[PDB]
Amino acid sequence: RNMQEKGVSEKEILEELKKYRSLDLKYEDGNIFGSMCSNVLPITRKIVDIFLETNLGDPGLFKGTKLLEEKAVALLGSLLNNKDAYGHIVSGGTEANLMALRCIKNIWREKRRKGLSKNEHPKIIVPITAHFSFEKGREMMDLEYIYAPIKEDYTIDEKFVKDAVEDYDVDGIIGIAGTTELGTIDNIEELSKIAKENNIYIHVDAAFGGLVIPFLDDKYKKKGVNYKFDFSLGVDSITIDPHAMGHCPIPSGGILFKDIGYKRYLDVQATILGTRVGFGGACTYAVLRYLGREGQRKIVNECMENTLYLYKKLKENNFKPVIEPILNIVAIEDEDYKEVCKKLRDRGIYVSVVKALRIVVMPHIKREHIDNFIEILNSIKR
Amino acid sequence: RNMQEKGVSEKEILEELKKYRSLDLKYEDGNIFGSMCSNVLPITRKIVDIFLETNLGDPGLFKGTKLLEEKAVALLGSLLNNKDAYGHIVSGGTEANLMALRCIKNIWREKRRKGLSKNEHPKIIVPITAHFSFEKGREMMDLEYIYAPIKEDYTIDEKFVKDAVEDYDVDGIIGIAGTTELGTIDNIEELSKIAKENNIYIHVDAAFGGLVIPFLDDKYKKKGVNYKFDFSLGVDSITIDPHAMGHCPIPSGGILFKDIGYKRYLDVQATILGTRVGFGGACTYAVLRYLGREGQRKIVNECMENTLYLYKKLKENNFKPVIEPILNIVAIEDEDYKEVCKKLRDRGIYVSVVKALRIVVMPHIKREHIDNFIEILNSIKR
Ligand SMILES: Cc1ncc(COP(=O)(O)O)c(CN[C@@H](Cc2ccc(O)cc2)C(=O)O)c1O
Ligand SMILES: Cc1ncc(COP(=O)(O)O)c(CN[C@@H](Cc2ccc(O)cc2)C(=O)O)c1O
């Protein structure tokens, strides 16, 4: 397509764009099974329109939108047991994780300048289940990762972390509250004890789980799983994303630090982006206020009901889930997962791909879609 | 503000948000004089709504939105004289510049792995007029910058660059097509010759100027200024941002590489962000199609008419512009610029702050606002 001298009418360009949108899948149609995003809360469409022409890169021009970012951060902080959190509503969990990594690296830099570190690059303990944003950060910022192995329950091996912190000079620890692949929860309580006893920064990636775990009804909690992950454990920062299980429009990611003392280690404006949306903070604040805990609890446990329904139907049909679900994520063991995924795609079922098919039971996934999924999968298996 | 158990009604939360929005400035009100963002083209509000629930981080689910990103990149490429450009509609000029820096660094890494570079970190020539995103990149990616001085016309000293490339092993050159502070245009033609003759990557930052320079009427072009900046000069990449002078909603930044061969140097998904908006590509494609060159020409040269009106009125009132404007940016020499800026702010005029006040004559700035500005400034000066 080449740039043209003459413009076209609104009707022409809107009809063209609608033809392309018709090629997309839509969350509400029973096709998308592998996404950690879903339909936005309908009220957010009005909020996006109100705040479209704001820019939190120049907050002096948009004092009210800036106050709403602060209020959104405060509500997330309150949810995470910290009324003094310092943070931002950023572009997503990637930027949030990258900012935590920047903070870790600048704490190390200060030590390095004072002769208080023998590491030529920050050394950070990262579980092998970490999201790919951590690899982007390693690659960009020249970080040294010590990859921590996982246990049979797919959570980080805390004894490895403890041993590594004794053997090596460590600049940071990462724990995950809701892994991307399986929805498992690292033992943040133990990791935070190790971190505190050794004066090591600890970041919790709760991009997905941060807006699920605090709302789980007791019947979905498992004996021997610890669900504690937030600032009550004294962690240094938490990633938590409204555009995942907060029903907010992209871009709405969250990064919270324990207090304002961390801001100075984000100096080079604290965000990676410059010009940036104002509607994310507005939507985050408004959705949490509109729903309250009661409304988010309802949505979370509706997803969990459908998750456990899917788990049951899978076993009934002789499929092997990787684990009993912890959050609203189920994975199905399959040796031919790559080909099965393509056969599912050919029949209108888009899962993600551990030698397993991964299903994220977001609010758009209803019982009828799970039944449909099981029928197609059964047929594929002959 | 604390998280509450009970939710609130839509009317309550919308009225609260509207009270905060009322504390913001609005572009159309004659207050904002220092922003490189402005009012969006009204059609984009419909496009945002259509594409709100898309995600270019998972383009396999949104094939049409992904095609629209490709078409948006193709139209920008065509505008920049390259029908084969490889690129993305990203979150802004910051992410675009960071991706160019990542590419430069990974070309260096490959050399380093083969023993073909004596530099322990990429060495990049950057003019002192570079936008702050280049400092974010330096700080994150451990780049070594050789800062190039500027000439009396505030453009990069090409002889310094040539000499430095002879004296040192250089991994990249940055040229700016529309500086943030003054709107000047580096001699990209000469920089590209140096770069080509020495096999050095060259990136052009046209975040602002890329959607102005191609549309300038001849009466605004100055003798002795070279306006050539695009892929006709053989440069490696160009940043160009629709949410600046493309009238598209944030986030709509642009990064274009000369061809698909650069994609492999963005390997670690090529964007920094993961989950990311689909409406930026839709809006970028649709605005350029809706306006055509004729419609963008009209807007650009309307801004330039108002820029030269402001320049004239300033001189008539014995104020000293830093330079005769090149793009739709004027700066006013003032020793007490900091205090004058605060006095302007107190009277409803928000400029930015070179010991000068900076005015960006975006489409929302009309003659009446310039007249109002001059009266207030005169009064402030007594
Ligand atoms: C634990 C965790 N941390 C960080 C991130 C990064 O967040 P952003 O994508 O907001 O930057 C993700 C993303 N999780 C999903 C994101 C996603 C969403 C929708 C999709 O259709 C596909 C993928 C994933 O990579 O699987 C995540 O799972
Ligand atoms: C040449 C140049 N390159 C890159 C960027 C970064 O682009 P993003 O801000 O899209 O990441 C800018 C931003 N120029 C403006 C951005 C801006 C816009 C509106 C404002 O109110 C204030 C600032 C500046 O920093 O001045 C720029 O001027």
Determine the angle formed by the axes of helices B43-51 and A43-51, rounding to 10 degrees. 140
Q: Where are the alpha helices (DSSP H) in chain B?
A: 10-21, 43-51, 63-79, 93-113, 133-141, 158-167, 188-198, 279-316, 337-346, 367-380
Tokens describing residue A153: 């329950």
User: Of A280, A173, A318, whose CA–CA distance to B52 is shortest?
Assistant: A280
Q: Find the length of chain A.
A: 382
CA torsion sign for A59, A61, A63, A67 is: negative
CA distance B263 to B281: 19
CA distance A36 to A356: 17
**Contact between A8 and B289 using a beta-carbon 8 Å cutoff:** yes
Measured in Å, residue A95 CA sits from the centre of ligand 1 at: 11
| Element holding B173 (H helix, E strand) | strand B172-176
Tokens describing residue A21: 């949108």
- Say if strands B144-148 and B123-127 run parallel, antiparallel, or are unpaired: parallel
CA distance A110 to A262: 13
Backbone angles phi, psi at B180, to 5 degrees: -60, -45
CA torsion sign for A289, A294, A300, A302 is: negative
- B115 C-beta neighbours (distance < 10 Å), count: 7
Instruction: Name the residue of chain B whose CA is nearest to A265's CA.
Output: B139
Give the contacts of A298 (CB within 8 A, at least 6 positions apart). none
Q: In this structure, what is the dihedral angle of CA atoms A246, A193, A112, A273, given to the nearest 10 degrees?
A: 0
Tokens describing residue B214: 């191609």
- A33 C-beta neighbours (distance < 10 Å), count: 23
Tokens describing residue A325: 């679900």
Task: For an interface test with B, give the residue of A8, A10, A11, A17 to mutate (most B CBs within 10 A).
Answer: A17
**Contact between B50 and A18 using a beta-carbon 8 Å cutoff:** yes
CA torsion sign for B193, B147, B200, B264 is: negative
Ligand whose nearest atom lies closest to the CA of B280: 2
Task: Region of A142 please: left (phi>0), alpha (psi -120 to 50) or beta.
Answer: left
How would you class B15 by CB atoms within 10 Å of its CB: exposed for 0-12, middle for 13-18, buried for 19 or more?
Answer: exposed
- Give me the amino acid identity at B370: I
Tokens describing residue B204: 């052009």
How would you class A267 by CB atoms within 10 Å of its CB: exposed for 0-12, middle for 13-18, buried for 19 or more?
Answer: exposed
Tokens describing residue A58: 């120049």
Residues of A in contact with B8 (CB under 8 A): 289-290, 292
Give the contacts of A86 (CB within 8 A, at least 6 positions apart). A73, A256, A257, A258, A259, A260, A261, A262, A263
Which residues precede gaps in chain A, with C-N > 2.5 A? Answer: 268, 353
**Contact between B68 and A8 using a beta-carbon 8 Å cutoff:** no
Place of tokens 């944030």: B250
Q: Is the CB of A205 under 6 A from ligand 1?
A: yes
User: Of A277, A260, A272, whose CA–CA distance to A74 is shortest?
Assistant: A260
Measured in Å, residue B275 CA sits from the centre of ligand 1 at: 6
In angstroms, the first-to-last Cα distance of chain B is 45
User: Of A264, A139, A133, whose CA–CA distance to A203 is shortest?
Assistant: A133
Long-range interactions of B53-56: CB distance < 8 A, separation 24+: B53/A26, B53/A27, B53/A37, B53/A39, B53/A40, B53/A249, B54/A21, B54/A24, B54/B277, B54/B278, B54/B279, B55/A35, B55/A37, B55/A250, B55/B275, B55/B276, B55/B277, B55/B278, B56/B89, B56/B276, B56/B277, B56/B278, B56/B281
Instruction: Name the residue of chain A whose CA is nearest to B41's CA.
Output: A53
User: Of B31, B131, B277, whose CA–CA distance to A52 is shortest?
Assistant: B277
Please answer whether residues A153 and A324 qualify as being in contact, where contact means their C-beta atoms are separated by less than 8 angstroms. no
- A309 C-beta neighbours (distance < 10 Å), count: 16
Per DSSP, what are the bridge partners of residue B128? Answer: none
- Say if strands A201-205 and B356-360 run parallel, antiparallel, or are unpaired: unpaired
- Say if strands B253-257 and B86-90 run parallel, antiparallel, or are unpaired: antiparallel
Instruction: Report DSSP state, residue B233.
Output: G
User: Of A213, A289, A286, A211, whose CA–CA distance to A254 is shortest?
Assistant: A211
Backbone angles phi, psi at A114, to 5 degrees: -95, 0
∠ at Cα A154 (A152, A155), nearest 5°?
110
CATH of domain A44-291: 3.40.640.10
User: Of B25, B15, B17, B24, whose CA–CA distance to A71 is shortest?
Assistant: B17
Rounded to a whole number of angstroms, the distance from the CA of A20 to the nearest CA of chain B is 4
Resolution (A): 1.8
Determine the angle formed by the axes of helices A367-380 and A279-316, rounding to 10 degrees. 50
- Give me the amino acid identity at B211: L
Q: In this structure, what is the dihedral angle of CA atoms B332, B243, B276, A245, given to the nearest 10 degrees?
A: 80
CA distance A129 to A176: 8
- Give me the amino acid identity at B95: E
Q: Is the CB of B262 under 6 A from ligand 2?
A: no
User: Of B277, B23, B3, whose CA–CA distance to A285 is shortest?
Assistant: B3
CA distance B72 to B69: 5
Backbone angles phi, psi at B197, to 5 degrees: -65, -25
Which of A3, A136, A249 lies at the smallest CB-CB distance from B79? A3
Per DSSP, what are the bridge partners of residue A124? Answer: A145, A172
CA distances to A58, A193, A305, A325, B318 from A220, in Å: 44, 26, 9, 9, 74
Please answer whether residues A243 and A169 qualify as being in contact, where contact means their C-beta atoms are separated by less than 8 angstroms. no
- B374 C-beta neighbours (distance < 10 Å), count: 16
Give the contacts of A278 (CB within 8 A, at least 6 positions apart). A51, A54, A55, A56, A62, A65, A66, A68, A69
Measured in Å, residue A249 CA sits from the centre of ligand 1 at: 14
CA distance B25 to B39: 12
User: Of A28, A240, A7, A299, whose CA–CA distance to B296 is shortest?
Assistant: A7
Please answer whether residues A151 and A161 qualify as being in contact, where contact means their C-beta atoms are separated by less than 8 angstroms. no
User: Of A299, A330, A153, whose CA–CA distance to A216 is shortest?
Assistant: A299
Q: Is the CB of A249 under 6 A from ligand 1?
A: no
**Contact between B250 and A277 using a beta-carbon 8 Å cutoff:** yes
Please answer whether residues A141 and A311 qualify as being in contact, where contact means their C-beta atoms are separated by less than 8 angstroms. no
Measured in Å, residue B62 CA sits from the centre of ligand 1 at: 16
What class is the A10-41+293-380 domain?
alpha beta
Give the contacts of A185 (CB within 8 A, at least 6 positions apart). A155, A176, A177, A178, A179, A209, A213, A225, A226, A227, A229, A326, A327
Measured in Å, residue A93 CA sits from the centre of ligand 1 at: 7
Q: In this structure, what is the dihedral angle of CA atoms A53, A59, A61, A64, given to the nearest 10 degrees?
A: 80
Q: Is the CB of B36 under 6 A from ligand 2?
A: yes
∠ at Cα A270 (A268, A275), nearest 5°?
105
CA distances to A287, A299, B58 from B6, in Å: 12, 14, 35
CA distance B112 to B129: 29
- Report residue B306 CA to chain centroid gap: 20
CA distance A280 to B27: 20
**Contact between B136 and A46 using a beta-carbon 8 Å cutoff:** no
Q: Is B209 helix (H, G, I), strand (E, B) or coil?
A: helix
Please answer whether residues A242 and A254 qualify as being in contact, where contact means their C-beta atoms are separated by less than 8 angstroms. yes
User: Of B306, B142, A126, whose CA–CA distance to A134 is shortest?
Assistant: A126
Please answer whether residues A75 and B3 qualify as being in contact, where contact means their C-beta atoms are separated by less than 8 angstroms. yes
Tokens describing residue B157: 């000293």
What burial letters (b/e) apply to A192-206, b meaning 16+ CB within 10 Å? bbbbeeeebbbbbbb
A241 CA closest ligand 1 atom index: 10
User: Of B20, B241, B269, B9, whose CA–CA distance to A292 is shortest?
Assistant: B9
B95 CA closest ligand 2 atom index: 11
Backbone angles phi, psi at B84, to 5 degrees: -115, 15
Backbone angles phi, psi at A15, to 5 degrees: -65, -35
Please answer whether residues B251 and A276 qualify as being in contact, where contact means their C-beta atoms are separated by less than 8 angstroms. yes
Structure determined by: X-ray
A178 CA closest ligand 1 atom index: 1
CA torsion sign for A122, A124, A129, A131 is: negative
Measured in Å, residue B288 CA sits from the centre of ligand 2 at: 21
Give the contacts of B196 (CB within 8 A, at least 6 positions apart). B234
User: Of B81, B262, B281, whose CA–CA distance to B188 is shortest?
Assistant: B81
Instruction: Give the 3-state DSSP-derived string for chain A, with helices as H, strands as E and coil as C.
Output: CCCCCCCCCHHHHHHHHHHHHCCCCCHHHCCECCCCCCCCCCHHHHHHHHHCCCCCCCHHHCHHHHHHHHHHHHHHHHHCCCCCCEEEEECCHHHHHHHHHHHHHHHHHHHHHCCCCCCCCCEEEEECCCCCHHHHHHHHHCCEEEEECECCCCCECHHHHHHHHHHCCCCEEEEEECCCCCCCECCHHHHHHHHHHHCCEEEEECCCHHHCHHHCCHHHCCCCCCCCCCHHHCCCEEECCCCCCCCCCCCCEEEEECCHHHHHHHCCCCCCCCCCCCHHHHHHHHHHHHHHHHHHHHHHHHHHHHHHHHHHHHHHCCCCECCCCCCCEEEEECCCHHHHHHHHHHCCCECECCCEEEEECCCCCCHHHHHHHHHHHHHHCC
Which of A39, A53, A95 lies at the smallest CB-CB distance from B53? A39
Place of tokens 């040192």: B168
**Contact between B75 and A1 using a beta-carbon 8 Å cutoff:** yes
A251 CA closest ligand 1 atom index: 10
User: Of A234, A254, A257, A237, whose CA–CA distance to A245 is shortest?
Assistant: A254
CA distance A358 to A322: 10
- Say if strands A329-333 and A253-257 run parallel, antiparallel, or are unpaired: unpaired
How would you class A21 by CB atoms within 10 Å of its CB: exposed for 0-12, middle for 13-18, buried for 19 or more?
Answer: buried
Instruction: Report DSSP state, residue B171.
Output: S
Rounded to a whole number of angstroms, the distance from the CA of A5 to the nearest CA of chain B is 5
CA distance A250 to A76: 17
Q: In this structure, what is the dihedral angle of CA atoms A135, A140, A146, A150, given to the nearest 10 degrees?
A: -10
Q: How is chain A split into domains, by residue range?
A: 10-41+293-380, 44-291
